[PDB]
Amino acid sequence: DSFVAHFREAAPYIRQMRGTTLVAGIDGRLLEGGTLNKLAADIGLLSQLGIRLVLIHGAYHFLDRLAAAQGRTPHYCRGLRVTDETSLGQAQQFAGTVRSRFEAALCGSSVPLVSGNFLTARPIGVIDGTDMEYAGVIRKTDTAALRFQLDAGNIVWMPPLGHSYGGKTFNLDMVQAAASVAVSLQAEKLVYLTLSDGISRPDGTLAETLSAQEAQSLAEHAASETRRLISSAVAALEGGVHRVQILNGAADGSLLQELFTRNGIGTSIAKEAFVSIRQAHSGDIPHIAALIRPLEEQGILLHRSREYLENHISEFSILEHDGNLYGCAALKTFAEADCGEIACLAVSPQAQDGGYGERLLAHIIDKARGIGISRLFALSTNTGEWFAERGFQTASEDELPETRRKDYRSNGRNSHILVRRLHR
Amino acid sequence: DSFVAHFREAAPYIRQMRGTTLVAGIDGRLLEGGTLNKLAADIGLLSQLGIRLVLIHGAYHFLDRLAAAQGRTPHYCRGLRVTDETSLGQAQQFAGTVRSRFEAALCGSSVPLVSGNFLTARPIGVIDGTDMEYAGVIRKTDTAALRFQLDAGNIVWMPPLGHSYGGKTFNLDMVQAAASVAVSLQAEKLVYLTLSDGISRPDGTLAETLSAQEAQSLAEHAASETRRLISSAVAALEGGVHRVQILNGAADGSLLQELFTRNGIGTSIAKEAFVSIRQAHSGDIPHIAALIRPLEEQGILLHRSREYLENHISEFSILEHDGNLYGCAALKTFAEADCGEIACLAVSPQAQDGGYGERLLAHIIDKARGIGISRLFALSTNTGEWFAERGFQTASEDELPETRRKDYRSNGRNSHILVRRLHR
Amino acid sequence: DSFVAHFREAAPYIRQMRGTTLVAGIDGRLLEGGTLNKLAADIGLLSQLGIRLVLIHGAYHFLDRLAAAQGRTPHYCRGLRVTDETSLGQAQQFAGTVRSRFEAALCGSSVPLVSGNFLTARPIGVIDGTDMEYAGVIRKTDTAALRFQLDAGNIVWMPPLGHSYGGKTFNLDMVQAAASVAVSLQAEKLVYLTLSDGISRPDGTLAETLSAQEAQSLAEHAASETRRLISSAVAALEGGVHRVQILNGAADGSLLQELFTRNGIGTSIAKEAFVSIRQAHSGDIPHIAALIRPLEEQGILLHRSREYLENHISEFSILEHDGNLYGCAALKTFAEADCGEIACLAVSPQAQDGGYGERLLAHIIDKARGIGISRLFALSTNTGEWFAERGFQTASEDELPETRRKDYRSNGRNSHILVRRLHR
Amino acid sequence: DSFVAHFREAAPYIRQMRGTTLVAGIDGRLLEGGTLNKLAADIGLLSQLGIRLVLIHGAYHFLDRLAAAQGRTPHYCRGLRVTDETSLGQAQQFAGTVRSRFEAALCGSSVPLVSGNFLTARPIGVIDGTDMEYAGVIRKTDTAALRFQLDAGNIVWMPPLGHSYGGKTFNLDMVQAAASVAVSLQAEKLVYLTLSDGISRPDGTLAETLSAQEAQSLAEHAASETRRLISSAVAALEGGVHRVQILNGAADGSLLQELFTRNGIGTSIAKEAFVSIRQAHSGDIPHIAALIRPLEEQGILLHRSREYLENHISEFSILEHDGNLYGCAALKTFAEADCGEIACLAVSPQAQDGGYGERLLAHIIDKARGIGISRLFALSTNTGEWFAERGFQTASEDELPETRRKDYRSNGRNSHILVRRLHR
Numbered sequence A, B, C, D: 001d002s003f004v005a006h007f008r009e010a011a012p013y014i015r016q017m018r019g020t021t022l023v024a025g026i027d028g029r030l031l032e033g034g035t036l037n038k039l040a041a042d043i044g045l046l047s048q049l050g051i052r053l054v055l056i057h058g059a060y061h062f063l064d065r066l067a068a069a070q071g072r073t074p075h076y077c078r079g080l081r082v083t084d085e086t087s088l089g090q091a092q093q094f095a096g097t098v099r100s101r102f103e104a105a106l107c108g109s110s111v112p113l114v115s116g117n118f119l120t121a122r123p124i125g126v127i128d129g130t131d132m133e134y135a136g137v138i139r140k141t142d143t144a145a146l147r148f149q150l151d152a153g154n155i156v157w158m159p160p161l162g163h164s165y166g167g168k169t170f171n172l173d174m175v176q177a178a179a180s181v182a183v184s185l186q187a188e189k190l191v192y193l194t195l196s197d198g199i200s201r202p203d204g205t206l207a208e209t210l211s212a213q214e215a216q217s218l219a220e221h222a223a224s225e226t227r228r229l230i231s232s233a234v235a236a237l238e239g240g241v242h243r244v245q246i247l248n249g250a251a252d253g254s255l256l257q258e259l260f261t262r263n264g265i266g267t268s269i270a271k272e273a274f275v276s277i278r279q280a281h282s283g284d285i286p287h288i289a290a291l292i293r294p295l296e297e298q299g300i301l302l303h304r305s306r307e308y309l310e311n312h313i314s315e316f317s318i319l320e321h322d323g324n325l326y327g328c329a330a331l332k333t334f335a336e337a338d339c340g341e342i343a344c345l346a347v348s349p350q351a352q353d354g355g356y357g358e359r360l361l362a363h364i365i366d367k368a369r370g371i372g373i374s375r376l377f378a379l380s381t382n383t384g385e386w387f388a389e390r391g392f393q394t395a396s397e398d399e400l401p402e403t404r405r406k407d408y409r410s411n412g413r414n415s416h417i418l419v420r421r422l423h424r
């Protein structure tokens, strides 16, 4: 399209991303090519948009491309890399050349860029018999100092090197280090810039959007490298990071396409919290009753009787935690096979505003879908916009299933009626 | 001595140094030896004492120790270094290894250390026919960003590398770069840590304390390397830096001995501002008269007559600028050859508090010294402590030269009498 | 030694002390002598080093030296002082002269010094029949206002006087007031400057370092004055203050020697928290098992069997709280009587980072010492530096007790071996 | 009146006083009586109203009431006080008792009150032969530290004591010290709380409102004590203080009545800047012409001709500085003896907004008054509210002097007409 249409398309994601923190793990290959000026520029822009940036790069591949040309062969283990003194020394060289060239590339074509001693490392030690020598993992990250630079508006640049209190230096694994830094900062987003296009499924298809479970279950059959991504992306989510993303850093302007279109072009991973939602039974009736009574009493929910719940308990879903129930929601069916109706949606006032509402609606929508329903009605007297704001369009008596149009007239509430269309 | 005596000796310099900025130019040799853990520790301490630190290191010697072992020979010019692409690339390697090892050394045996893209460079260009290729000099230093890190309490670490807006990188001369950064920050002190003990004089003697003139005149006969120090130290002073210092970074704990003892152990350089102080003549009498009248009229200065100034004008010194006079001061002599007396010391109220007072006293003391006087009296009614605070001890009528003891009794002012001893 | 050696010796304590708060209770005798210029200077320095200072002085002795010369005799009670209106009035005089002279002494030989109405007092009331009249104790300290002055870098000076909301003034006991102010500020250190050298033991020996228990048990046989110190020093520790210290304010530069040498020269008191550490029994095995399993499973701890723990349960120590166990650690012995080995050291992840690790190592070291062991080995695969950092030096297969060298080869883990020497 | 009417009366002065600084010099007698609780309360309130308070008290009278009861007699000189060591020591006692009791009184019947070492003193030295011993005057006030406490909302309390850098203490004269502190802070108001009702005139009348000149000329015949007030109040004004005030601190709630009523009850002093305003002559015509032309050209001022100014130059006043003119203003008279008219009022755009406008109107009003005019008209097309806002009420053609009503109709401008009444 036109410039304007594209700019307006990006606007909502610009809104979201603003004043948010984003930790980028970057493959060290991308710091050498012509792939460098391009992505320095894209990072520049990210800065220009009020995004707080932390950047970490790896060095494994450079190290190896020096081992190879040297006669030496690299040993990895549990996926990590045995780093001797000489190659630890070469990684400090590499970090100096990559940071300086990223800087030059960042300056010409003035964004404040900063670096410091934020990471303290300790040696991974020995694994399965094998000494990881100078392979480190992060022991203690200085979260305050970093916030402080990011507060100032500075982009933070981190090499894959931590220091120990014995005055030693340890090579860090970029992929797990970026995950750990993101967890410390509670970053809204962790972005891994790799050399592939996201993460594939069994047969060839690039996985757009994945839950942590689904990612988890891809890994059973996936190549070891992408196995390590997912495991680090899973641990990050579990640690607090709202969203992790895998892209191809080599594919021109991929970074921008991911962040600022509904599409994206790589893979995106997110963890739903635990939300036991189960089909109700006669045991739950006093609980639903207690929850729902005061809302009836206030005119928010249609009067009911215990008889109705006894005889209708199979259209009810409940949301529980540690036994106790915090929500419920019903689905009514009708003579018309295309229609459903979500009713008696409620959540404890004390567990309100945490997404329980949304999870119950989702659950009933999947329940409705799974039985052929393509039009979900909601009839509400004081909560219409909650539904309006979640895909429900305004409707009318005459659009309702015949019998419901009946009960609507004779119940007297003059509630607002809404429908949402559900597809294949 | 004991710990306590040493700690109390350091206290006054600790007072001075606190919250003050200090830019250290460091020879890159000192970043490799066992000379590294030692001086990381001393810099640590400096930090611990509330000193704002900027650190810059050179790379010339490392570069050369790579040219030599390569077959290549290094060309310098007007004292600077022709840096080709390959050696520019090696200086980025060097900076990564030196910053990482200084860090490790700084961490073990936690001080906040920071680095960023504060320098923009431009190529020195061509000199006397010779292309300096990638030899840069600083074009624009980001003074705000630096203050901001130093305000936070961070030690700033700078490599000898600036970036251009064409996305190129230029090797910087440490010695002149540290001078330029210090000038930008208006640092109170610029410290060059070298491999010699300060700067020698003609015959062998280490020059403790030098004015910029005196340094300037040593350089006519001095080795080119120390010639370049002095020229950069001179330009720094002229630019605002209150004090520049040359030490031996290799000599264990030299840094600490310089800053925190009256002694020091290297050389220290400072510029007096311009202070035309000349022997008065009959032309100045109305000016002195005008200056001095209102103070007489107030009881601060002994009454006088124009006759006295006419006939006594040769014991008077005046301080001038752009013709106009801002101060004067007399020296009286007596039958006793060991005695003098500073009198009629005065400075315009509008040029007060800038050191003019002090310069006039100094000048009369040199005048007194040069004629064999070893005891300078001052007789003041409302300004005793100005003299007390500058080496004058309390005295009495009976200590005065006989005739002055006479005039003292019969002038009636009951001014306080002070003396200062002056030696060989 | 030399200046440099002394300065480097002080550096680590300078590091510690920086930005830390220190409340000094000062005997009012020390505010009169030649002991005043000396310790104003030392306090000056303390300021110069970034230490936040609160200062409180007493007046009892001055009051008494006025009662005596007056005919009057002073009555104390439960160790405190009955202050009538007239002597309350004289303590306000004393505070004005002592604050003014401390100031003058502080200014000449410029540190920001501040004072205000931070203390509200209430009357101690009546004790054992006796009216303490104008003897107050602190009712409410304005902790915010004080932090605020200390944040500004000001030294706070407090007289032993609080005000009541009835508009009355109450004399405060310096020793207990300094303890209360320190508790409010949660100061890292409380320092009492007295006229003796610390606190003695039964027979003559100056007690260098004491736990609160040990101090507590000295007091059963100690002179009443030092009894009151310890009781106030104990309550301070219990209240949060990390460390309280008793010195001789009269002994020149004692203050500096305490803070900045390993030695010190007075007495120092600290409270260990509660840390039930007991010899394990067959009941603890499932708990240790549960703790230790997942670490085995991860390769951090040597595989074991329940049989081993059943038959080896006597070399195990466990750390408990409210029944539940949070840590364990074993000591192995060998045919060589000089050798031991700490093994199976572990702490719950949820109670990690609170010093439990350290307490278990300490406990096993005392256990090893008490049975003649002078060389403690530790064999760790992924936790060597935890031991390196706590007095363990690197070792080798050949240094191990013969049998352990055996098991080491044939267990296959290629863990790192460390030893620590333990003396008499 | 009623509470409401009084509160509304105070409101406008509350507006003015808010966030403004007020330095109070307080006679030390007022710190002892029942006059203490009363004025602590009134100062309290002042604080409660957002007024930044600095308070300084004297001690002379207490000192003397100790000299008298001792046999000793006090010597003053040029109005100041010879303070020996013993009485310097007693003033430190006095300051401790007065600050403590003011505090108690301030607390009961919680306002933050602060004190520190803001003053450095130097000895007045010797005057007219006489040694002022420990009589000091302020050498350097720490203006930053004080602003900083006042910024925090703290009331600052200062004793009449400064310290020297020789570690000595000097008694300060409250009256001149408060003037010097006020000048440093550029305080909006300096308030001297004495034991009389303001400053009298020749015959008995309390002087309400005085210019610095008028105060100056009262002093030729005034008692020495009030002579010293005026001289210190004059120097303060000249130094920047907008307004100094003399009250009776003993008269209950005088402080409040001064600040918050149009009345006041003591005396108030203010300095007009220099404002050469002189009757114009034929020399000024080109200058007025140049000033006034562009405003005519814009429709702001009635067209004129040079002829009119030539023949009418005697009704013109001009405001000059260094020769150059910055303003002018005319007064027209009419057949009606009660009428005047201010016209052709103008000020250079470059000297606008500094009160020149106001000074010209004032000058013409005095000119009009002095010739019997009781109704000043102003006819303006684009500047009515400037006049509305300065005592002019709206009027109409028919209210104008007959001839002016004529010229008004036939000039065509439909300017707005305003009048101001002027009385005896």
Ligand SMILES: CC(=O)SCCNC(=O)CCNC(=O)[C@@H](O)C(C)(C)COP(=O)(O)OP(=O)(O)OC[C@H]1O[C@@H](n2cnc3c(N)ncnc32)[C@H](O)[C@@H]1OP(=O)(O)O
Pocket (backbone or CB within 6 Å): A295, A300, A301, A342, A343, A344, A345, A346, A347, A348, A351, A352, A353, A354, A355, A356, A357, A358, A359, A378, A379, A380, A381, A382, A383, A384, A385, A386
């Ligand atoms: C068809 C029907 O069943 S009609 C009956 C609907 N149920 C009721 O009205 C019961 C009373 N209300 C509730 O119980 C509400 O908590 C629910 C069920 C609507 C939503 O529960 P939650 O767990 O709080 O839902 P969820 O957390 O997903 O959404 C919370 C958001 O809904 C918004 N919301 C809550 N009530 C309303 C409302 N009455 N109108 C508009 N928005 C609302 C909240 O403000 C909150 O806003 P936010 O996104 O800006 O923070």
Ligand SMILES: CC(=O)SCCNC(=O)CCNC(=O)[C@@H](O)C(C)(C)COP(=O)(O)OP(=O)(O)OC[C@H]1O[C@@H](n2cnc3c(N)ncnc32)[C@H](O)[C@@H]1OP(=O)(O)O
Pocket (backbone or CB within 6 Å): B295, B300, B301, B342, B343, B344, B345, B346, B347, B348, B351, B352, B353, B354, B355, B356, B357, B358, B359, B378, B379, B380, B381, B382, B383, B384, B385, B386, D122, D139, D140
């Ligand atoms: C023996 C004799 O001639 S007696 C006559 C001495 N002359 C007079 O008293 C004339 C009146 N005073 C002056 O003219 C003063 O300016 C002088 C001549 C004493 C000093 O002139 P400056 O150029 O201001 O001297 P300089 O700048 O070196 O020192 C200024 C410092 O002196 C301090 N100083 C100035 N006057 C005095 C004083 N009367 N007492 C104590 N210290 C003083 C100022 O406070 C300033 O203090 P700082 O170091 O804290 O900022």
Ligand SMILES: CC(=O)SCCNC(=O)CCNC(=O)[C@@H](O)C(C)(C)COP(=O)(O)OP(=O)(O)OC[C@H]1O[C@@H](n2cnc3c(N)ncnc32)[C@H](O)[C@@H]1OP(=O)(O)O
Pocket (backbone or CB within 6 Å): A122, A139, A140, C295, C300, C301, C342, C343, C344, C345, C346, C347, C348, C351, C352, C353, C354, C355, C356, C357, C358, C359, C378, C379, C380, C381, C382, C383, C384, C385, C386
């Ligand atoms: C010989 C042997 O038994 S080998 C087996 C050692 N045990 C294990 O490795 C079990 C896994 N690790 C643990 O259980 C760790 O908690 C322990 C036992 C080593 C220490 O427990 P804690 O109660 O946390 O000890 P403590 O609180 O005294 O010390 C905590 C500090 O140790 C540091 N530390 C923890 N693990 C390590 C490690 N693997 N390497 C280096 N330092 C470490 C922590 O970072 C923390 O650092 P800090 O001082 O900068 O805050």
Ligand SMILES: CC(=O)SCCNC(=O)CCNC(=O)[C@@H](O)C(C)(C)COP(=O)(O)OP(=O)(O)OC[C@H]1O[C@@H](n2cnc3c(N)ncnc32)[C@H](O)[C@@H]1OP(=O)(O)O
Pocket (backbone or CB within 6 Å): D295, D300, D301, D342, D343, D344, D345, D346, D347, D348, D351, D352, D353, D354, D355, D356, D357, D358, D359, D378, D379, D380, D381, D382, D383, D384, D385, D386
């Ligand atoms: C009857 C007659 O002579 S009509 C002709 C009046 N003269 C003109 O209009 C000439 C154009 N204006 C001027 O020359 C204006 O500067 C003057 C003469 C009105 C005032 O001159 P100043 O020296 O600026 O007067 P002064 O400093 O006492 O007052 C300045 C204030 O007047 C206010 N003021 C200035 N012009 C106007 C205006 N046109 N209307 C309302 N208020 C105004 C300014 O905003 C300023 O406001 P402040 O008090 O909020 O800061």
